[PDB]
Write a protein that binds this ligand. Sequence first.
Ligand code: CA
Ligand code: CA
Lengths: 289, 288
Amino acid sequence: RNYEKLSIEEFGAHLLGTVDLDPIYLALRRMELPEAQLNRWLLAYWCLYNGGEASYLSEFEGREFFEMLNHAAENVREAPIGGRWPRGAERRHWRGAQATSSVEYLIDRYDDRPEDMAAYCAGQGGTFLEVTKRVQEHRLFGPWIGFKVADMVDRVLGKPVSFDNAAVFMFKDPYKAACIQYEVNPNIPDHVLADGSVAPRNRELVTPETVHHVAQHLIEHFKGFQAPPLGDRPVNIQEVETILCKWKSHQNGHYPLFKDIVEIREAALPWAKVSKTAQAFFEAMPEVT
Amino acid sequence: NYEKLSIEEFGAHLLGTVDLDPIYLALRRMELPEAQLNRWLLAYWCLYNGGEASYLSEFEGREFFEMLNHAAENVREAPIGGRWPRGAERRHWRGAQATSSVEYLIDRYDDRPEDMAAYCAGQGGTFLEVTKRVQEHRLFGPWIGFKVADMVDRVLGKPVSFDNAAVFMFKDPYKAACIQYEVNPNIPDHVLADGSVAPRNRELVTPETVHHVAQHLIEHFKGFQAPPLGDRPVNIQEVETILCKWKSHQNGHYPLFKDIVEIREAALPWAKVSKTAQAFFEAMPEVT
DNA sequence: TAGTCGTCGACT
DNA sequence: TAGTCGACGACTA
Ligand SMILES: [Ca+2]
Ligand SMILES: [Ca+2]
Protein backbone atom coordinates (compact mmCIF):
# COMPACT_ATOMS: atom_id res chain seq x y z
CA ARG A 1 0.00 0.00 0.00
CA ASN A 2 1.21 3.58 -0.76
CA TYR A 3 0.41 5.80 2.26
CA GLU A 4 0.51 9.53 3.06
CA LYS A 5 4.04 10.91 3.53
CA LEU A 6 4.16 13.10 6.65
CA SER A 7 6.49 15.87 7.67
CA ILE A 8 9.14 14.99 10.26
CA GLU A 9 7.33 17.08 12.89
CA GLU A 10 4.09 15.09 12.49
CA PHE A 11 5.75 11.70 11.91
CA GLY A 12 7.95 12.20 14.95
CA ALA A 13 4.97 13.31 17.05
CA HIS A 14 3.29 10.04 16.15
CA LEU A 15 6.40 8.02 16.96
CA LEU A 16 6.56 9.66 20.42
CA GLY A 17 2.83 9.64 21.19
CA THR A 18 2.26 5.98 20.23
CA VAL A 19 5.63 4.80 21.67
CA ASP A 20 6.30 3.45 18.17
CA LEU A 21 9.70 5.20 18.40
CA ASP A 22 11.43 2.35 20.24
CA PRO A 23 8.86 -0.07 21.69
CA ILE A 24 11.44 -2.72 22.69
CA TYR A 25 12.68 -0.31 25.37
CA LEU A 26 9.24 -0.10 27.00
CA ALA A 27 8.72 -3.87 26.90
CA LEU A 28 12.17 -4.42 28.39
CA ARG A 29 11.51 -1.96 31.20
CA ARG A 30 8.19 -3.67 31.91
CA MET A 31 9.74 -7.14 32.12
CA GLU A 32 12.10 -6.10 34.95
CA LEU A 33 14.37 -9.04 34.13
CA PRO A 34 17.16 -9.89 36.60
CA GLU A 35 20.54 -8.40 35.74
CA ALA A 36 22.35 -11.46 34.44
CA GLN A 37 19.33 -12.48 32.36
CA LEU A 38 18.83 -8.94 31.04
CA ASN A 39 22.46 -8.86 29.89
CA ARG A 40 22.08 -12.20 28.12
CA TRP A 41 18.82 -11.05 26.55
CA LEU A 42 20.61 -7.92 25.28
CA LEU A 43 23.66 -9.65 23.82
CA ALA A 44 21.34 -12.06 22.02
CA TYR A 45 19.18 -9.17 20.79
CA TRP A 46 22.25 -7.25 19.50
CA CYS A 47 23.23 -10.34 17.49
CA LEU A 48 19.88 -11.35 16.02
CA TYR A 49 17.72 -8.26 16.61
CA ASN A 50 14.63 -10.38 17.37
CA GLY A 51 12.90 -9.91 20.75
CA GLY A 52 11.20 -13.30 21.09
CA GLU A 53 14.37 -15.20 20.16
CA ALA A 54 16.45 -13.13 22.56
CA SER A 55 13.87 -14.00 25.26
CA TYR A 56 14.21 -17.70 24.51
CA LEU A 57 17.99 -17.45 24.55
CA SER A 58 18.07 -15.28 27.70
CA GLU A 59 16.89 -18.34 29.71
CA PHE A 60 20.02 -20.37 28.95
CA GLU A 61 23.06 -19.57 31.08
CA GLY A 62 26.84 -19.84 30.93
CA ARG A 63 28.37 -21.95 28.17
CA GLU A 64 24.88 -23.29 27.39
CA PHE A 65 23.96 -19.75 26.32
CA PHE A 66 26.86 -19.54 23.89
CA GLU A 67 26.18 -23.08 22.63
CA MET A 68 22.57 -22.10 21.82
CA LEU A 69 23.83 -18.86 20.26
CA ASN A 70 26.24 -20.77 18.06
CA HIS A 71 23.28 -22.89 16.91
CA ALA A 72 21.36 -19.76 15.93
CA ALA A 73 24.54 -18.53 14.23
CA GLU A 74 24.88 -21.74 12.19
CA ASN A 75 21.13 -21.87 11.43
CA VAL A 76 21.29 -25.53 10.39
CA ARG A 77 19.37 -27.08 13.25
CA GLU A 78 15.72 -26.10 13.31
CA ALA A 79 14.43 -23.46 15.72
CA PRO A 80 12.09 -24.03 18.70
CA ILE A 81 9.38 -22.13 16.78
CA GLY A 82 9.95 -24.31 13.70
CA GLY A 83 11.87 -23.22 10.60
CA ARG A 84 15.22 -21.48 10.55
CA TRP A 85 16.57 -19.19 13.30
CA PRO A 86 15.19 -15.73 12.45
CA ARG A 87 17.11 -12.46 12.20
CA GLY A 88 15.93 -8.90 12.51
CA ALA A 89 16.19 -6.98 9.25
CA GLU A 90 18.98 -4.78 10.67
CA ARG A 91 20.87 -8.03 11.45
CA ARG A 92 20.03 -9.76 8.14
CA HIS A 93 23.76 -10.14 7.45
CA TRP A 94 24.62 -11.86 10.77
CA ARG A 95 25.01 -15.32 9.13
CA GLY A 96 27.59 -17.82 7.91
CA ALA A 97 31.19 -17.41 8.91
CA GLN A 98 30.44 -13.83 9.97
CA ALA A 99 27.97 -15.01 12.60
CA THR A 100 30.09 -17.96 13.77
CA SER A 101 33.38 -16.05 14.00
CA SER A 102 31.35 -13.48 15.95
CA VAL A 103 30.29 -16.14 18.47
CA GLU A 104 33.80 -17.63 18.70
CA TYR A 105 35.04 -14.13 19.48
CA LEU A 106 32.54 -13.81 22.34
CA ILE A 107 33.17 -17.35 23.62
CA ASP A 108 36.91 -16.70 23.58
CA ARG A 109 36.42 -13.50 25.53
CA TYR A 110 33.60 -14.20 27.96
CA ASP A 111 33.90 -18.00 28.31
CA ASP A 112 31.16 -19.00 30.78
CA ARG A 113 30.03 -15.40 31.57
CA PRO A 114 27.99 -14.09 28.61
CA GLU A 115 26.37 -11.60 31.01
CA ASP A 116 29.66 -9.71 31.07
CA MET A 117 29.46 -8.35 27.50
CA ALA A 118 26.57 -5.95 28.08
CA ALA A 119 27.99 -5.23 31.55
CA TYR A 120 31.31 -4.23 29.97
CA CYS A 121 29.59 -2.19 27.22
CA ALA A 122 27.39 -0.53 29.86
CA GLY A 123 30.23 0.11 32.30
CA GLN A 124 28.97 2.86 34.54
CA GLY A 125 27.94 4.74 31.41
CA GLY A 126 30.22 7.41 30.00
CA THR A 127 30.24 9.37 26.75
CA PHE A 128 28.62 8.02 23.59
CA LEU A 129 32.09 7.70 22.03
CA GLU A 130 33.44 5.67 24.94
CA VAL A 131 30.40 3.37 24.97
CA THR A 132 30.37 2.86 21.20
CA LYS A 133 34.10 2.13 21.06
CA ARG A 134 33.62 -0.57 23.72
CA VAL A 135 30.80 -2.12 21.67
CA GLN A 136 32.85 -1.94 18.52
CA GLU A 137 35.63 -4.06 20.00
CA HIS A 138 33.61 -7.21 19.36
CA ARG A 139 33.78 -8.97 16.03
CA LEU A 140 30.78 -8.23 13.72
CA PHE A 141 29.82 -5.22 15.89
CA GLY A 142 30.13 -1.91 14.08
CA PRO A 143 28.94 1.68 14.08
CA TRP A 144 25.15 1.05 13.89
CA ILE A 145 24.99 -1.36 16.83
CA GLY A 146 27.42 0.77 18.87
CA PHE A 147 25.01 3.69 18.72
CA LYS A 148 22.03 1.42 19.41
CA VAL A 149 23.75 -0.11 22.43
CA ALA A 150 24.63 3.33 23.80
CA ASP A 151 20.96 4.28 23.44
CA MET A 152 19.89 1.12 25.29
CA VAL A 153 22.55 1.52 27.98
CA ASP A 154 20.80 4.78 28.88
CA ARG A 155 17.14 4.01 28.05
CA VAL A 156 17.07 0.39 29.26
CA LEU A 157 20.00 -0.01 31.72
CA GLY A 158 19.69 3.44 33.27
CA LYS A 159 23.42 4.09 33.17
CA PRO A 160 24.36 7.72 32.38
CA VAL A 161 25.41 7.98 28.74
CA SER A 162 26.22 11.48 27.51
CA PHE A 163 25.23 11.94 23.84
CA ASP A 164 26.21 15.61 23.60
CA ASN A 165 27.30 16.52 20.08
CA ALA A 166 26.78 12.95 18.81
CA ALA A 167 24.81 14.20 15.79
CA VAL A 168 27.98 14.31 13.63
CA PHE A 169 28.63 10.66 14.55
CA MET A 170 25.21 9.31 13.57
CA PHE A 171 25.11 6.21 11.41
CA LYS A 172 24.95 6.80 7.63
CA ASP A 173 21.16 6.60 7.37
CA PRO A 174 20.15 9.02 10.18
CA TYR A 175 22.97 11.28 8.95
CA LYS A 176 21.79 11.17 5.32
CA ALA A 177 18.31 11.81 6.73
CA ALA A 178 19.67 14.98 8.40
CA CYS A 179 21.14 16.04 5.03
CA ILE A 180 17.81 15.56 3.24
CA GLN A 181 16.01 17.47 6.02
CA TYR A 182 18.19 20.59 5.70
CA GLU A 183 17.33 20.64 1.99
CA VAL A 184 13.58 19.94 2.13
CA ASN A 185 12.24 21.08 5.53
CA PRO A 186 11.47 24.84 5.47
CA ASN A 187 10.94 24.91 9.27
CA ILE A 188 14.68 24.27 9.74
CA PRO A 189 16.17 27.79 9.75
CA ASP A 190 19.00 28.74 7.45
CA HIS A 191 22.37 27.65 8.81
CA VAL A 192 24.35 30.88 8.96
CA LEU A 193 28.04 29.97 8.72
CA ALA A 194 30.77 31.82 10.59
CA ASP A 195 31.60 33.81 7.43
CA GLY A 196 27.99 35.11 7.41
CA SER A 197 27.03 32.98 4.36
CA VAL A 198 24.16 30.48 4.35
CA ALA A 199 24.86 26.74 3.94
CA PRO A 200 23.36 25.59 0.61
CA ARG A 201 20.05 23.76 0.87
CA ASN A 202 21.42 20.81 -1.09
CA ARG A 203 21.53 17.34 0.48
CA GLU A 204 24.72 16.54 -1.48
CA LEU A 205 26.69 19.40 0.19
CA VAL A 206 25.51 19.12 3.82
CA THR A 207 28.49 19.17 6.16
CA PRO A 208 28.83 17.74 9.67
CA GLU A 209 28.19 21.20 11.18
CA THR A 210 24.92 21.60 9.26
CA VAL A 211 23.77 18.14 10.35
CA HIS A 212 24.41 19.34 13.89
CA HIS A 213 22.37 22.47 13.17
CA VAL A 214 19.57 20.17 11.87
CA ALA A 215 19.56 17.82 14.88
CA GLN A 216 19.71 20.77 17.28
CA HIS A 217 16.64 22.35 15.68
CA LEU A 218 14.68 19.09 15.85
CA ILE A 219 15.59 18.50 19.49
CA GLU A 220 14.29 21.96 20.28
CA HIS A 221 11.22 21.23 18.17
CA PHE A 222 10.28 18.11 20.15
CA LYS A 223 11.34 19.60 23.53
CA GLY A 224 7.70 19.37 24.67
CA PHE A 225 7.93 15.56 24.50
CA GLN A 226 9.41 13.59 27.37
CA ALA A 227 11.57 10.80 26.02
CA PRO A 228 10.22 7.22 26.21
CA PRO A 229 10.23 4.62 27.71
CA LEU A 230 9.72 6.42 31.08
CA GLY A 231 9.51 10.11 30.20
CA ASP A 232 12.38 11.06 32.53
CA ARG A 233 13.81 13.85 30.35
CA PRO A 234 12.98 15.81 27.19
CA VAL A 235 13.84 14.34 23.81
CA ASN A 236 17.53 14.58 22.91
CA ILE A 237 19.71 13.48 19.99
CA GLN A 238 18.95 9.83 20.86
CA GLU A 239 15.27 10.12 19.97
CA VAL A 240 15.94 12.60 17.14
CA GLU A 241 18.40 10.17 15.59
CA THR A 242 15.56 7.63 15.45
CA ILE A 243 12.96 10.10 14.20
CA LEU A 244 15.44 11.15 11.51
CA CYS A 245 16.09 7.60 10.34
CA LYS A 246 12.47 6.36 10.42
CA TRP A 247 11.32 9.51 8.62
CA LYS A 248 13.65 8.76 5.69
CA SER A 249 12.22 5.23 5.54
CA HIS A 250 8.70 6.61 5.86
CA GLN A 251 9.34 8.93 2.91
CA ASN A 252 10.83 6.07 0.87
CA GLY A 253 7.71 3.92 1.29
CA HIS A 254 9.44 1.61 3.81
CA TYR A 255 7.85 2.71 7.10
CA PRO A 256 4.07 2.88 7.27
CA LEU A 257 2.75 4.19 10.58
CA PHE A 258 3.17 1.67 13.44
CA LYS A 259 5.49 -0.53 11.31
CA ASP A 260 7.73 -1.47 14.24
CA ILE A 261 5.07 -2.33 16.84
CA VAL A 262 3.24 -4.46 14.27
CA GLU A 263 6.41 -6.16 13.02
CA ILE A 264 7.68 -6.80 16.58
CA ARG A 265 4.48 -8.52 17.74
CA GLU A 266 4.12 -10.69 14.62
CA ALA A 267 7.64 -12.08 14.81
CA ALA A 268 7.39 -12.54 18.61
CA LEU A 269 4.07 -14.40 18.89
CA PRO A 270 5.68 -17.73 17.76
CA TRP A 271 8.25 -17.49 20.57
CA ALA A 272 5.60 -16.74 23.20
CA LYS A 273 4.74 -20.48 22.94
CA VAL A 274 8.24 -21.82 23.68
CA SER A 275 9.48 -19.47 26.42
CA LYS A 276 7.94 -17.85 29.49
CA THR A 277 10.25 -14.85 29.05
CA ALA A 278 9.08 -14.66 25.45
CA GLN A 279 5.50 -14.70 26.76
CA ALA A 280 6.37 -11.80 29.09
CA PHE A 281 8.07 -10.01 26.15
CA PHE A 282 4.98 -10.24 23.93
CA GLU A 283 2.68 -9.13 26.79
CA ALA A 284 4.94 -6.20 27.73
CA MET A 285 4.96 -4.99 24.07
CA PRO A 286 2.81 -1.89 23.53
CA GLU A 287 -0.03 -2.09 20.99
CA VAL A 288 -1.35 -0.08 18.07
CA THR A 289 -3.92 2.58 18.96
CA ASN B 1 77.17 3.57 -14.94
CA TYR B 2 78.48 0.16 -13.96
CA GLU B 3 78.34 -3.40 -15.17
CA LYS B 4 75.01 -5.08 -14.36
CA LEU B 5 75.74 -8.66 -13.29
CA SER B 6 73.57 -11.75 -13.31
CA ILE B 7 72.10 -12.79 -9.97
CA GLU B 8 74.44 -15.79 -9.80
CA GLU B 9 77.54 -13.61 -10.13
CA PHE B 10 76.17 -10.71 -8.10
CA GLY B 11 75.05 -13.05 -5.32
CA ALA B 12 78.40 -14.81 -5.27
CA HIS B 13 79.99 -11.37 -4.80
CA LEU B 14 77.65 -10.50 -1.92
CA LEU B 15 78.43 -13.81 -0.19
CA GLY B 16 82.19 -13.90 -0.68
CA THR B 17 82.80 -10.26 0.33
CA VAL B 18 80.34 -10.38 3.32
CA ASP B 19 78.58 -7.41 1.63
CA LEU B 20 75.30 -9.38 1.93
CA ASP B 21 74.57 -8.16 5.47
CA PRO B 22 77.74 -6.77 7.07
CA ILE B 23 75.96 -5.42 10.21
CA TYR B 24 75.39 -9.00 11.42
CA LEU B 25 79.11 -9.77 11.42
CA ALA B 26 79.95 -6.48 13.12
CA LEU B 27 77.32 -7.16 15.78
CA ARG B 28 78.56 -10.71 16.36
CA ARG B 29 82.10 -9.40 16.77
CA MET B 30 81.18 -6.66 19.25
CA GLU B 31 79.82 -9.28 21.75
CA LEU B 32 77.82 -6.65 23.66
CA PRO B 33 76.02 -7.50 26.93
CA GLU B 34 72.48 -8.83 26.53
CA ALA B 35 70.54 -5.74 27.59
CA GLN B 36 72.70 -3.42 25.48
CA LEU B 37 72.37 -5.67 22.44
CA ASN B 38 68.59 -5.43 22.79
CA ARG B 39 68.84 -1.64 23.05
CA TRP B 40 71.22 -1.44 20.11
CA LEU B 41 68.76 -3.49 18.05
CA LEU B 42 65.69 -1.50 18.97
CA ALA B 43 67.49 1.73 18.10
CA TYR B 44 68.71 0.28 14.82
CA TRP B 45 65.24 -1.05 13.98
CA CYS B 46 63.81 2.49 14.39
CA LEU B 47 66.57 4.54 12.72
CA TYR B 48 68.51 1.94 10.69
CA ASN B 49 71.87 3.60 11.42
CA GLY B 50 74.46 1.45 13.17
CA GLY B 51 76.65 4.21 14.58
CA GLU B 52 73.64 6.12 15.86
CA ALA B 53 72.22 2.93 17.39
CA SER B 54 75.57 2.23 19.04
CA TYR B 55 75.60 5.64 20.71
CA LEU B 56 72.00 5.31 21.92
CA SER B 57 72.62 1.71 23.06
CA GLU B 58 74.75 3.00 25.95
CA PHE B 59 71.82 4.79 27.62
CA GLU B 60 69.62 2.60 29.84
CA GLY B 61 66.05 2.44 31.14
CA ARG B 62 63.91 5.51 30.63
CA GLU B 63 67.00 7.48 29.66
CA PHE B 64 67.15 5.26 26.57
CA PHE B 65 63.66 6.23 25.48
CA GLU B 66 64.27 9.90 26.25
CA MET B 67 67.25 9.88 23.88
CA LEU B 68 65.29 7.87 21.29
CA ASN B 69 62.49 10.43 21.45
CA HIS B 70 65.17 13.05 20.80
CA ALA B 71 66.21 11.22 17.63
CA ALA B 72 62.51 10.85 16.74
CA GLU B 73 61.87 14.58 17.17
CA ASN B 74 65.09 15.60 15.38
CA VAL B 75 64.92 19.12 16.86
CA ARG B 76 67.97 19.08 19.13
CA GLU B 77 71.34 18.72 17.48
CA ALA B 78 72.89 15.33 17.29
CA PRO B 79 76.09 14.38 19.17
CA ILE B 80 77.69 14.06 15.74
CA GLY B 81 76.63 17.59 14.84
CA GLY B 82 73.74 18.10 12.47
CA ARG B 83 70.48 16.21 12.43
CA TRP B 84 69.76 12.74 13.82
CA PRO B 85 70.48 10.55 10.79
CA ARG B 86 68.17 7.92 9.30
CA GLY B 87 69.03 4.94 7.16
CA ALA B 88 67.46 5.16 3.73
CA GLU B 89 65.15 2.25 4.62
CA ARG B 90 63.94 4.30 7.60
CA ARG B 91 63.75 7.65 5.75
CA HIS B 92 60.06 7.81 6.74
CA TRP B 93 60.63 7.27 10.53
CA ARG B 94 60.09 10.98 11.18
CA GLY B 95 57.57 13.49 12.40
CA ALA B 96 54.43 12.31 14.11
CA GLN B 97 55.13 8.78 12.83
CA ALA B 98 58.45 8.57 14.68
CA THR B 99 57.12 10.10 17.89
CA SER B 100 53.99 7.96 17.77
CA SER B 101 56.31 5.00 17.32
CA VAL B 102 58.39 6.00 20.35
CA GLU B 103 55.38 6.77 22.52
CA TYR B 104 54.07 3.30 21.70
CA LEU B 105 57.33 1.73 22.85
CA ILE B 106 57.37 3.75 26.08
CA ASP B 107 53.75 2.87 26.81
CA ARG B 108 54.59 -0.84 26.47
CA TYR B 109 58.13 -1.24 27.83
CA ASP B 110 58.37 1.76 30.21
CA ASP B 111 61.81 1.49 31.86
CA ARG B 112 62.77 -1.84 30.22
CA PRO B 113 63.64 -1.00 26.58
CA GLU B 114 65.59 -4.28 26.53
CA ASP B 115 62.29 -6.13 26.53
CA MET B 116 61.26 -5.17 22.98
CA ALA B 117 63.88 -7.22 21.15
CA ALA B 118 63.55 -9.96 23.78
CA TYR B 119 59.82 -10.19 23.12
CA CYS B 120 60.38 -10.16 19.38
CA ALA B 121 63.07 -12.81 19.74
CA GLY B 122 61.23 -14.92 22.29
CA GLN B 123 62.83 -18.32 21.95
CA GLY B 124 62.52 -18.19 18.19
CA GLY B 125 59.71 -19.92 16.41
CA THR B 126 58.47 -19.60 12.87
CA PHE B 127 59.33 -16.62 10.68
CA LEU B 128 55.61 -16.02 10.59
CA GLU B 129 55.38 -16.03 14.40
CA VAL B 130 58.29 -13.64 14.84
CA THR B 131 57.23 -11.13 12.16
CA LYS B 132 53.78 -10.98 13.74
CA ARG B 133 55.41 -10.18 17.10
CA VAL B 134 57.58 -7.54 15.49
CA GLN B 135 54.60 -6.09 13.66
CA GLU B 136 52.64 -5.46 16.85
CA HIS B 137 54.73 -2.33 17.36
CA ARG B 138 53.75 0.99 15.82
CA LEU B 139 55.62 1.85 12.60
CA PHE B 140 56.84 -1.76 12.35
CA GLY B 141 55.52 -3.44 9.22
CA PRO B 142 56.37 -6.34 6.96
CA TRP B 143 59.82 -5.15 5.82
CA ILE B 144 61.27 -4.69 9.33
CA GLY B 145 59.43 -7.78 10.56
CA PHE B 146 61.25 -9.97 8.05
CA LYS B 147 64.49 -8.11 8.83
CA VAL B 148 64.13 -8.59 12.59
CA ALA B 149 63.27 -12.26 12.08
CA ASP B 150 66.47 -12.61 10.04
CA MET B 151 68.42 -10.89 12.79
CA VAL B 152 66.97 -12.98 15.63
CA ASP B 153 68.58 -15.96 13.88
CA ARG B 154 71.68 -14.43 12.31
CA VAL B 155 72.56 -12.17 15.25
CA LEU B 156 70.74 -13.46 18.36
CA GLY B 157 71.14 -17.14 17.45
CA LYS B 158 67.60 -18.19 18.32
CA PRO B 159 65.97 -20.86 16.12
CA VAL B 160 63.71 -19.24 13.51
CA SER B 161 62.31 -21.55 10.84
CA PHE B 162 62.07 -19.65 7.53
CA ASP B 163 60.77 -22.62 5.57
CA ASN B 164 58.43 -21.67 2.72
CA ALA B 165 58.87 -17.98 3.60
CA ALA B 166 59.48 -17.08 -0.06
CA VAL B 167 55.82 -16.25 -0.71
CA PHE B 168 55.94 -13.78 2.22
CA MET B 169 58.98 -11.76 1.14
CA PHE B 170 58.57 -8.00 1.14
CA LYS B 171 57.47 -6.08 -2.00
CA ASP B 172 60.88 -5.59 -3.58
CA PRO B 173 62.49 -9.06 -3.18
CA TYR B 174 59.17 -10.54 -4.26
CA LYS B 175 59.18 -8.37 -7.42
CA ALA B 176 62.82 -9.37 -7.87
CA ALA B 177 61.75 -13.03 -7.95
CA CYS B 178 59.03 -12.14 -10.49
CA ILE B 179 61.59 -10.37 -12.72
CA GLN B 180 63.95 -13.33 -12.22
CA TYR B 181 61.48 -15.90 -13.59
CA GLU B 182 61.07 -13.74 -16.68
CA VAL B 183 64.73 -12.97 -17.36
CA ASN B 184 66.99 -15.66 -15.85
CA PRO B 185 67.42 -18.53 -18.37
CA ASN B 186 69.03 -20.67 -15.63
CA ILE B 187 65.74 -20.90 -13.73
CA PRO B 188 63.94 -23.97 -15.16
CA ASP B 189 60.35 -23.67 -16.35
CA HIS B 190 57.81 -23.86 -13.55
CA VAL B 191 55.52 -26.80 -14.41
CA LEU B 192 52.23 -26.36 -12.55
CA ALA B 193 50.23 -29.20 -11.04
CA ASP B 194 48.08 -29.37 -14.17
CA GLY B 195 51.26 -29.82 -16.27
CA SER B 196 51.11 -26.35 -17.78
CA VAL B 197 54.18 -24.08 -17.86
CA ALA B 198 53.99 -20.72 -16.10
CA PRO B 199 54.71 -17.88 -18.61
CA ARG B 200 58.02 -16.04 -18.63
CA ASN B 201 56.38 -12.72 -17.82
CA ARG B 202 57.11 -10.76 -14.62
CA GLU B 203 53.59 -9.31 -14.50
CA LEU B 204 51.99 -12.79 -14.44
CA VAL B 205 54.12 -14.53 -11.77
CA THR B 206 52.08 -16.19 -8.98
CA PRO B 207 53.25 -17.00 -5.39
CA GLU B 208 53.99 -20.63 -6.31
CA THR B 209 56.23 -19.43 -9.11
CA VAL B 210 57.92 -17.02 -6.67
CA HIS B 211 58.50 -20.01 -4.39
CA HIS B 212 59.83 -21.99 -7.36
CA VAL B 213 62.24 -19.14 -8.15
CA ALA B 214 63.38 -18.86 -4.55
CA GLN B 215 63.86 -22.60 -4.38
CA HIS B 216 66.10 -22.64 -7.48
CA LEU B 217 68.35 -19.88 -6.12
CA ILE B 218 68.65 -21.66 -2.78
CA GLU B 219 69.91 -24.73 -4.61
CA HIS B 220 72.28 -22.59 -6.75
CA PHE B 221 73.99 -21.04 -3.69
CA LYS B 222 73.97 -24.25 -1.61
CA GLY B 223 77.75 -24.44 -1.89
CA PHE B 224 77.90 -21.19 0.10
CA GLN B 225 77.73 -21.25 3.89
CA ALA B 226 75.59 -18.36 5.19
CA PRO B 227 77.15 -15.35 6.98
CA PRO B 228 77.96 -14.17 9.54
CA LEU B 229 79.52 -17.51 10.73
CA GLY B 230 78.81 -20.14 8.07
CA ASP B 231 76.82 -22.41 10.40
CA ARG B 232 74.44 -23.67 7.69
CA PRO B 233 73.93 -23.52 3.93
CA VAL B 234 72.28 -20.44 2.45
CA ASN B 235 68.49 -20.51 2.80
CA ILE B 236 65.59 -18.24 1.80
CA GLN B 237 66.93 -15.53 4.19
CA GLU B 238 70.11 -14.85 2.23
CA VAL B 239 68.37 -15.46 -1.12
CA GLU B 240 65.73 -12.85 -0.22
CA THR B 241 68.56 -10.34 0.33
CA ILE B 242 70.31 -11.34 -2.89
CA LEU B 243 67.01 -10.95 -4.76
CA CYS B 244 66.31 -7.41 -3.53
CA LYS B 245 69.91 -6.21 -3.89
CA TRP B 246 70.03 -7.65 -7.41
CA LYS B 247 66.89 -5.72 -8.36
CA SER B 248 68.65 -2.55 -7.05
CA HIS B 249 71.89 -3.44 -8.82
CA GLN B 250 69.87 -3.75 -12.04
CA ASN B 251 68.11 -0.44 -11.41
CA GLY B 252 71.49 1.32 -11.03
CA HIS B 253 71.20 1.78 -7.26
CA TYR B 254 73.64 -0.85 -5.91
CA PRO B 255 77.11 -1.02 -7.43
CA LEU B 256 79.37 -3.65 -5.88
CA PHE B 257 80.24 -3.06 -2.18
CA LYS B 258 77.52 -0.38 -1.84
CA ASP B 259 76.53 -1.35 1.69
CA ILE B 260 79.98 -1.79 3.26
CA VAL B 261 81.06 1.55 1.77
CA GLU B 262 77.98 3.47 2.91
CA ILE B 263 77.85 2.04 6.46
CA ARG B 264 81.44 2.99 7.38
CA GLU B 265 81.06 6.54 6.03
CA ALA B 266 77.91 7.10 8.10
CA ALA B 267 79.47 5.34 11.16
CA LEU B 268 82.90 6.99 11.39
CA PRO B 269 81.53 10.24 12.92
CA TRP B 270 79.85 8.22 15.68
CA ALA B 271 83.11 6.45 16.59
CA LYS B 272 84.18 9.68 18.32
CA VAL B 273 81.15 10.11 20.58
CA SER B 274 80.64 6.51 21.74
CA LYS B 275 82.99 3.71 22.77
CA THR B 276 80.47 1.24 21.40
CA ALA B 277 80.31 3.18 18.13
CA GLN B 278 84.08 2.84 17.78
CA ALA B 279 83.91 -0.92 18.38
CA PHE B 280 81.15 -1.11 15.76
CA PHE B 281 83.34 0.75 13.23
CA GLU B 282 86.32 -1.55 13.96
CA ALA B 283 84.20 -4.73 13.70
CA MET B 284 82.69 -3.58 10.39
CA PRO B 285 84.08 -5.61 7.44
CA GLU B 286 86.21 -3.94 4.80
CA VAL B 287 86.24 -3.63 1.01
CA THR B 288 87.81 -6.56 -0.90
C1' DT C 1 63.64 -3.56 1.21
C1' DA C 2 58.21 1.94 4.69
C1' DG C 3 54.18 2.16 7.00
C1' DT C 4 49.46 4.09 7.78
C1' DC C 5 45.25 5.79 6.47
C1' DG C 6 40.57 6.23 4.14
C1' DT C 7 37.77 5.23 0.08
C1' DC C 8 35.62 1.94 -2.84
C1' DG C 9 33.83 -2.20 -4.56
C1' DA C 10 32.83 -7.02 -3.85
C1' DC C 11 31.13 -10.43 -0.65
C1' DT C 12 28.50 -12.56 2.97
C1' DT D 1 20.00 2.04 10.72
C1' DA D 2 25.55 -3.92 8.66
C1' DG D 3 30.08 -5.16 8.79
C1' DT D 4 34.45 -7.08 6.83
C1' DC D 5 37.94 -7.94 3.43
C1' DG D 6 41.59 -6.57 0.09
C1' DA D 7 43.15 -3.44 -3.46
C1' DC D 8 44.78 1.27 -4.29
C1' DG D 9 46.59 5.91 -3.98
C1' DA D 10 47.91 9.67 -1.18
C1' DC D 11 50.61 11.05 2.58
C1' DT D 12 54.55 11.41 5.93
C1' DA D 13 60.98 15.19 5.05
CA1 CA E 1 18.00 5.01 17.16
CA1 CA F 1 67.15 -9.38 3.80
